[PDB]
Amino acid sequence: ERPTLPIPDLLTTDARNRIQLTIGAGQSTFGGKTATTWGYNGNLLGPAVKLQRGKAVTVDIYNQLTEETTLHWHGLEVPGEVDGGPQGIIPPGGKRSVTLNVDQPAATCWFHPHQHGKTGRQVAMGLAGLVVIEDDEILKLMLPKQWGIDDVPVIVQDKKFSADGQIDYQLDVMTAAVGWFGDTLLTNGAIYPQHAAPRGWLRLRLLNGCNARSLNFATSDNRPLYVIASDGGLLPEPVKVSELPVLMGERFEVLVEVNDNKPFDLVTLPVSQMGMAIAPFDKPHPVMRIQPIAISASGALPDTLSSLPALPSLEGLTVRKLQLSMDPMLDMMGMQMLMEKYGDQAMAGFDFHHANKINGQAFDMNKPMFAAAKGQYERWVISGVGDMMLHPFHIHGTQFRILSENGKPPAAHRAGWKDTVKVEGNVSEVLVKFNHDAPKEHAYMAHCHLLEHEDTGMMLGFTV
Ligand SMILES: [Cu+2]
């Protein structure tokens, strides 16, 4: 509760409607020990790219690594050609430009690499940034809006380090099964930082940027969170909660009341997921310390945020079934290594590189599974019947509606605009529409956002 919370620079267009992102390596320090890290416009993580609905921007992307990478805009409704999936290679030393014509509601999205079979490693190395989409609707609401004062991004990620201090990442049979997770928790790159927040309302834009660890946010003194937005933007009205589960890649925006001068913690609560309840995550774990201060803020919590469209009628819509599966050998072999390495705490609460799949096929980049309709709602049925793993299933090129999440209607705060849906040993249904095109050369991806599962096959391509 000591270093101040790092705040990503809010990056806007220049006079020529361009934005420069440089992808480079550098050095970060975690707990006294230095580590090689990757970042956008810096050594670690990245900026918050600010975009206005209905305004085009060109982004110039400079790969200053010595290996290939891609830049995917997670949550953005844009054509496949700029979507930055594994076919959007930026060679080392190379420069690629993309045009983003933003046409979707205000939201906190994010961007990260999407290299073929290396997404987990590139994100673990430090690469992630934010996208703040604004529109006319949101600025009329009088929410907390002072960036890095009462409107603050909170990117929570776990990492594991070697004895030398270097990030200890590996795509092996255990991580291919259960995911890459660590024992150290970072908040905008820092360990248990403090943020100084004005009395009144504090707005937190939460991002679970872990490779595989699911989270569950609360406060130390159990004051509520007022959920105001999901992956794809504002909810119709606030949802007041005591805790907030957040899957890998999901974003929620919450308001928290800063009503006295007593400091408290934003925390994450222990979750039931293979590997994730191992100490120190067997108990509530602090994310950041919040320190009330008496400086000016005028943000507020409205009664009503937005009006969303109704769910479409289901009659006549195309149904697409996506069956997620793991090779049994991976499951057991991965489970053995987990039990070997950690023991009984691990469950508290044959090429493995193509062992994870959808409709019995490990991802093949030259063969898109189908062409989805443009401008027409479809019903996608995603089943995890057959294993007990957690699958936060993400679909590019869209913000959808969850019709059913793992056997029930979605929770109220998950019933708005989402690009991620929980699949865990059951079936989920989403109502999805694609407003933009994606040819086979720049196909959209649908995949599990437990990145090691993605990297080892749990992904498909599709065209629109
Ligand atoms: Cu998965």
Swiss-Prot record:
Activity-pH dependence: Optimum pH is 6.5 with 2,6-DMP as substrate. The pH dependence of the reaction as monitored by oxygen consumption shows a broad activity peak between pH 5 and 6 and a second activity peak at pH 8.
Activity regulation, free text: Ferroxidase and phenoloxidase activities are enhanced considerably in the presence of excess copper ions. A labile regulatory copper ion near the T1 copper site is important for the copper associated activation of enzyme activity. Ag(+) acts as a potent inhibitor of oxidase activity by binding at Cu(+) binding sites, blocking Cu(+) substrate binding and oxidation. pPD oxidase activity is strongly inhibited by sodium azide, an inhibitor of the electron transfer.
The keyword Oxidoreductase is assigned to this record: yes
EC number: 1.16.3.4
Compartments where found: Periplasm
Activity relative to temperature: Optimum temperature is 55 degrees Celsius with 2,6-DMP as substrate.
GO cellular component: outer membrane-bounded periplasmic space; periplasmic space
Required cofactor names: Cu cation
Keyword Repeat: yes
Enzyme class label: oxidoreductase
SUPFAM superfamilies in alphabetical order: Cupredoxins
Binding site for Cu cation 2: H74, H112, H449
Plastocyanin-like domain ranges (all copies): 26-136, 198-263, 350-464
Comment block on domains: Contains a methionine-rich region, which includes a helix that covers the entrance to the type 1 (T1) copper site and blocks access to the T1 site in the absence of excess copper. This methionine-rich insert is involved in the binding and oxidation of Cu(+). It also binds additional copper ions, which are important for the copper-associated regulation of activity. The methionine-rich region provides at least three additional Cu(+) binding sites: Cu5 (sCu), Cu6 and Cu7, which play related but distinct roles in CueO oxidase activities.
Biological function: Multicopper oxidase involved in copper homeostasis and copper tolerance under aerobic conditions. Is responsible for the oxidation of Cu(+) to the less harmful Cu(2+) in the periplasm, thereby preventing Cu(+) from entering the cytoplasm. Probably primarily functions as a cuprous oxidase in vivo.
Subunit structure: Monomer.
Protein name: Multicopper oxidase CueO
Encoding gene per record: cueO
